[PDB]
Scaffold this active site. Structure first.
Site, PDB file in Angstrom:
ATOM      1  N   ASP A  43       0.761  -1.247   0.000  1.00 16.82           N
ATOM      2  CA  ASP A  43       0.000   0.000   0.000  1.00 16.82           C
ATOM      3  C   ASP A  43       0.799   1.309   0.000  1.00 16.82           C
ATOM      4  O   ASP A  43       1.284   1.756   1.043  1.00 16.82           O
ATOM      5  CB  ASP A  43      -0.923  -0.074   1.217  1.00 16.82           C
ATOM      6  CG  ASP A  43      -1.868   1.092   1.328  1.00 16.82           C
ATOM      7  OD1 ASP A  43      -1.829   2.010   0.479  1.00 16.82           O
ATOM      8  OD2 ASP A  43      -2.657   1.066   2.296  1.00 16.82           O
ATOM      9  N   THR A  44       0.906   1.941  -1.168  1.00 18.61           N
ATOM     10  CA  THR A  44       1.654   3.194  -1.288  1.00 18.61           C
ATOM     11  C   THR A  44       0.968   4.382  -0.609  1.00 18.61           C
ATOM     12  O   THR A  44       1.593   5.425  -0.407  1.00 18.61           O
ATOM     13  CB  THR A  44       1.892   3.573  -2.765  1.00 18.61           C
ATOM     14  OG1 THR A  44       0.634   3.632  -3.446  1.00 18.61           O
ATOM     15  CG2 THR A  44       2.800   2.549  -3.447  1.00 18.61           C
ATOM     16  N   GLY A  45      -0.313   4.226  -0.278  1.00 24.97           N
ATOM     17  CA  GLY A  45      -1.050   5.297   0.372  1.00 24.97           C
ATOM     18  C   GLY A  45      -0.892   5.281   1.887  1.00 24.97           C
ATOM     19  O   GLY A  45      -1.229   6.256   2.565  1.00 24.97           O
TER      20      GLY A  45
HETATM   21  C1  LIG Z   1     -10.253   4.282  -0.531  1.00 25.98           C
HETATM   22  C2  LIG Z   1     -10.441   2.768  -0.522  1.00 25.98           C
HETATM   23  C3  LIG Z   1     -11.348   2.180  -1.461  1.00 25.98           C
HETATM   24  O1  LIG Z   1     -12.036   2.978  -2.353  1.00 25.98           O
HETATM   25  C4  LIG Z   1     -11.559   0.781  -1.493  1.00 25.98           C
HETATM   26  C5  LIG Z   1     -10.872  -0.059  -0.594  1.00 25.98           C
HETATM   27  C6  LIG Z   1      -9.970   0.494   0.345  1.00 25.98           C
HETATM   28  C7  LIG Z   1      -9.737   1.902   0.401  1.00 25.98           C
HETATM   29  C8  LIG Z   1      -8.782   2.449   1.410  1.00 25.98           C
HETATM   30  O2  LIG Z   1      -9.073   3.351   2.198  1.00 25.98           O
HETATM   31  N1  LIG Z   1      -7.544   1.881   1.436  1.00 25.98           N
HETATM   32  C9  LIG Z   1      -6.554   2.232   2.464  1.00 25.98           C
HETATM   33  C10 LIG Z   1      -6.293   1.134   3.531  1.00 25.98           C
HETATM   34  C11 LIG Z   1      -7.144  -0.096   3.438  1.00 25.98           C
HETATM   35  C12 LIG Z   1      -7.028  -1.033   2.374  1.00 25.98           C
HETATM   36  C13 LIG Z   1      -7.869  -2.171   2.336  1.00 25.98           C
HETATM   37  C14 LIG Z   1      -8.835  -2.385   3.362  1.00 25.98           C
HETATM   38  C15 LIG Z   1      -8.956  -1.460   4.425  1.00 25.98           C
HETATM   39  C16 LIG Z   1      -8.108  -0.318   4.457  1.00 25.98           C
HETATM   40  C17 LIG Z   1      -5.319   2.800   1.757  1.00 25.98           C
HETATM   41  O3  LIG Z   1      -4.987   2.341   0.487  1.00 25.98           O
HETATM   42  C18 LIG Z   1      -4.415   3.828   2.482  1.00 25.98           C
HETATM   43  O4  LIG Z   1      -3.287   3.473   2.792  1.00 25.98           O
HETATM   44  N2  LIG Z   1      -4.988   5.031   2.928  1.00 25.98           N
HETATM   45  C19 LIG Z   1      -6.324   5.570   2.552  1.00 25.98           C
HETATM   46  S1  LIG Z   1      -6.625   7.040   3.556  1.00 25.98           S
HETATM   47  C20 LIG Z   1      -4.897   7.253   3.971  1.00 25.98           C
HETATM   48  C21 LIG Z   1      -4.254   8.164   2.905  1.00 25.98           C
HETATM   49  C22 LIG Z   1      -4.822   7.928   5.360  1.00 25.98           C
HETATM   50  C23 LIG Z   1      -4.290   5.810   3.971  1.00 25.98           C
HETATM   51  C24 LIG Z   1      -4.475   5.002   5.307  1.00 25.98           C
HETATM   52  O5  LIG Z   1      -5.550   4.449   5.565  1.00 25.98           O
HETATM   53  N3  LIG Z   1      -3.347   4.980   6.099  1.00 25.98           N
HETATM   54  C25 LIG Z   1      -3.191   4.298   7.409  1.00 25.98           C
HETATM   55  C26 LIG Z   1      -3.415   2.775   7.261  1.00 25.98           C
HETATM   56  C27 LIG Z   1      -1.746   4.571   7.859  1.00 25.98           C
HETATM   57  C28 LIG Z   1      -4.167   4.896   8.457  1.00 25.98           C
END
Ligand SMILES: Cc1c(O)cccc1C(=O)N[C@@H](Cc1ccccc1)[C@H](O)C(=O)N1CSC(C)(C)[C@H]1C(=O)NC(C)(C)C
EC number: 3.4.23.16
Lengths: 99, 99
Positions: B25-27
């Protein structure tokens, strides 16, 4: 281009003629943008994130430019911590992970 | 290797002597794993995103084997919906975004 991950992979995108900063997010299935006006009708959608599921507005075939690459696809609008460019569009601009 | 984003970029990892499936996860700024026992001391921490915030336990200098590459860093443990490999560890295996 090749983007390292020592810092957040943030880029400039263009939607509706406006420039915005967004995160290249391989962990997101969709693209989620902060509240803004988009053309056309929208459909309901539930996406699950780190803290649970939320409700967003789904707009299809939206024109969006990412770091210079033009894409046309689904964009969700709702309460997001940052503008997220998810897999649906990353694939469109030919983005891959490499190591 | 080169990973496409047509589907979730899931990989097998070995952490704390346990095998697990996780998302590249790059995000994600951090690496977050479902409840499990880990060595050393820890401190509470709150992380948030799409669904809001969740409380986790921060463990430092934890070794994680990802696709043959060994990486060392901070690992957060808590009620995450999916195991997440964040940038803190993605950098260590030389992972980059390319298009
Ligand atoms: C936006 C989205 C969809 O439309 C569909 C599925 C999952 C996400 C999602 O939020 N993905 C997340 C994490 C996640 C993936 C699969 C299952 C559950 C959760 C993510 O890619 C990330 O790192 N994000 C999205 S928001 C953010 C920029 C703060 C960061 C984050 O959550 N970071 C922490 C984990 C460090 C809190």
């Amino acid at each position: 281009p090749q983007i390292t991950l020592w810092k957040r992979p943030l880029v400039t995108i263009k939607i509706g003629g406006q420039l915005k900063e967004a995160l290249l997010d391989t962990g997101a299935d969709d693209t989620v943008i902060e509240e803004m006006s988009l053309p056309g009708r929208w459909k309901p959608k539930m996406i699950g994130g780190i803290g649970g599921f939320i409700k967003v507005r789904q707009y299809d075939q939206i024109i969006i430019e990412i770091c210079g690459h033009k894409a046309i696809g689904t964009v969700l609008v709702g309460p997001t911590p940052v503008n997220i460019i998810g897999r649906n569009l990353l694939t469109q601009i030919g983005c891959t992970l490499n190591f």
